Enzyme design. Structure first.
Site, mmCIF file in Angstrom:
data_model
loop_
_atom_site.group_PDB
_atom_site.id
_atom_site.type_symbol
_atom_site.label_atom_id
_atom_site.label_comp_id
_atom_site.label_asym_id
_atom_site.label_seq_id
_atom_site.Cartn_x
_atom_site.Cartn_y
_atom_site.Cartn_z
ATOM 1 C CD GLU A 1 -2.982 -1.062 0.171
ATOM 2 O OE1 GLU A 1 -3.093 -0.070 -0.605
ATOM 3 O OE2 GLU A 1 -3.740 -2.042 0.097
ATOM 4 C CB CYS B 1 -5.930 -1.822 7.212
ATOM 5 S SG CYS B 1 -6.424 -3.497 7.677
ATOM 6 C CG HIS C 1 -3.998 -4.340 2.629
ATOM 7 N ND1 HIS C 1 -4.136 -3.059 2.143
ATOM 8 C CD2 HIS C 1 -4.663 -4.366 3.814
ATOM 9 C CE1 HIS C 1 -4.887 -2.351 2.969
ATOM 10 N NE2 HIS C 1 -5.209 -3.114 3.997
#
Lengths: 208, 215, 210, 209
Positions: free
Chosen positions: D81, D144, D168
């Site tokens: 990410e 998250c 992730h």
């Protein structure tokens, strides 16, 4: 009245059409009593997209920028909430230029979110029976670049006051030509996509 | 016969009632729209079938007994499909955890005891797909129509065709959700594909208008 | 002589890939000892003409009770148990011999399709209970994989050998996705270790499916 | 030994009995790396307590790099990410039953931060080691993303941690094997391969900062 700049992009990537351009051309023939509608087709070019756009902002006072772009593979009206400060793709633009991991504005903020009431836009479209949803990535190509440019310019100069990016499905004719598993990609007719953008323009006061 | 290549084709166009919580079914809407059968070369019959393991083929059989049909063009909803989905294969199986509209659940049941495991259509299905694409309509050939009511009706017609000669041909066309059906969806389902009623109707219209080139 | 005689097949790499998960599993299990079955293994070419020739010669020369055919299904995310084989060759892609087949029967005046007689839902349930993603599919494509499946089910119907056939399509190995460009970098995969365990579990539990 | 690294995971949520992020952290909590001083921490899936627990750990420990792990059910590869956004937004409650709709994480904080870790180099290393991996530009708007934004914001205003990256993770195969309907076809990645991916990131950390 509200000054609205509605933009689209020229065809790219081997396509013969771009739904954003077709919508803009169709709506350039449309009268809205509550807005002064400006229309503009932008090049799919890392250099020239924002040059053309900046020159339009410099010569015309724009209150709201409504940017349209093609999002091949998307199935609904894809309302983009986030523009990020990055050019990154292995694919060249229409000038043959490739950008990898490049800032749009040196020491600009990492990203902007639109200040338009984007969930209200999605809700209006769904109530009018049009598939529509909110997305948090507009990619890192020319579409995101123009979006970031407008939101940054809005932040630093106050003009435009608002900006929103609307990604669009392929037109059915663009999928009808595809080979292999891509023949199964989603699409939306030009008539329905045009109606969606028209509904946004007709109800703009509710979103700003 | 004595008519040679001059008889008008009798075509049975069917759709299904809404099911699974939907308030509409694109197959039913297209059939209603095309109800106004201004076709120079065919005698168009229409029929809406229940989404019911038992009654779907009873209603269909009842129509087959009371009218003469050369080609069955069965329409059905394929929620999640993005284009005109031309089905080539019908299999001899009822299997789904989902009940029909009468509350029946069928799991691993033959449709016709000691019928063949499957039938393929004898319609020139690749030519249908090629015609639709050339007319700028997304379309493709599928090799599974599921194991629910749609497949059941498809297998019934191709089996009845094999043993009785009536109908002479059958084709099943699965259809995307209408945009209004996706506009009501929750969560990730808000991103499902759809196709306007106008374009779906045009696709079925084009199949009917060009039937000679497919049989 | 009297245990269950099982033919486990896989395919060579094709389509620009340098490995094929079916081949790798067959190679690994050809090295294993299965005390309760007589396991035959065979790697088949990805060839419209030669796949069933090689397969037929094995059937001619060995008594096989059950054929368990493995193949690659790039893009699939779990163990994909195929229920249906259809009497059709159709793909725009050539085989490894450069041959292209469009809209041709496999067996002239053979049935349009066969379904496996293996208790395929029980296979899926066993795998899921053993924590392995698995599901039943109703199309195995129209390429070499489906061709071999149809060949075995037709031969079983016409001669009685093999008594049973089942086709198992397999995800890409992770190394096959790791090389992909563009959006294909997001394709599903399953490690060779888990794929091999899945096929081992099918072989170990065969009595429950026939 | 030199780099102080905080490796975090999350508790199970959404009806799952496991969380791949938690399992990886447990597996690696004993692992010694010659170049790193490894901290581990399991965070609650809670809008309120996640960043409270995290802030308390940062306050009492000198962390150079935060490597946050989380579950991304439906993703097929190691999902690196790049972007954390200043927004809590989901229809779904956290494990404490709270729902957040369009709430800022940090009032008048920047709209988003990008990691300063060399994230494309992380993806290229994983791919060269035969592990599917790719760069993502939305980590969602749930717990998250919240933890990611918190760490990057804290890094910008305080200097601690110096860097943060969020990874992730696919479902474990056991999580898909229990799924009904069309969800039985979801992608997965074994715990062994996911653990190897995170181990490789830790082993090569100096290449990315």
């Amino acid at each position: 009245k509200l000054s609205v700049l509605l933009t689209g992009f020229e065809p790219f990537g081997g396509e013969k059409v771009n739904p954003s351009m077709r919508i803009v051309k169709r709506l350039s023939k449309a009268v809205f009593p509550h807005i002064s509608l400006h229309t503009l087709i932008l090049p799919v070019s890392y250099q020239k997209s924002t040059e053309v756009l900046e020159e339009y902002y410099k010569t015309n006072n724009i209150d709201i920028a409504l940017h349209l772009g093609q999002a091949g593979g998307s199935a609904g009206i894809r309302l983009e909430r986030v523009a990020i400060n990055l050019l990154d793709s292995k694919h060249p633009d229409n000038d043959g230029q490739v950008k990898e991991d490049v800032s749009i504005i040196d020491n600009g903020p990492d990203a902007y979110m639109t200040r338009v009431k984007i969930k209200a836009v999605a809700e209006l479209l769904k109530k009018k029976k049009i598939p529509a949803f909110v997305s948090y990535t507009a990619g890192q190509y020319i579409c995101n670049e123009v979006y970031y440019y407008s939101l940054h310019r809005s932040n630093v100069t106050g003009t435009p006051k608002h900006a929103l990016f609307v990604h669009l499905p392929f037109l059915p004719e663009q999928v009808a030509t595809k080979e292999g598993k891509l023949e199964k990609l989603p699409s939306m007719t030009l008539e329905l996509q045009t109606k969606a953008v028209r509904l946004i323009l007709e109800n703009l006061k509710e979103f700003i």
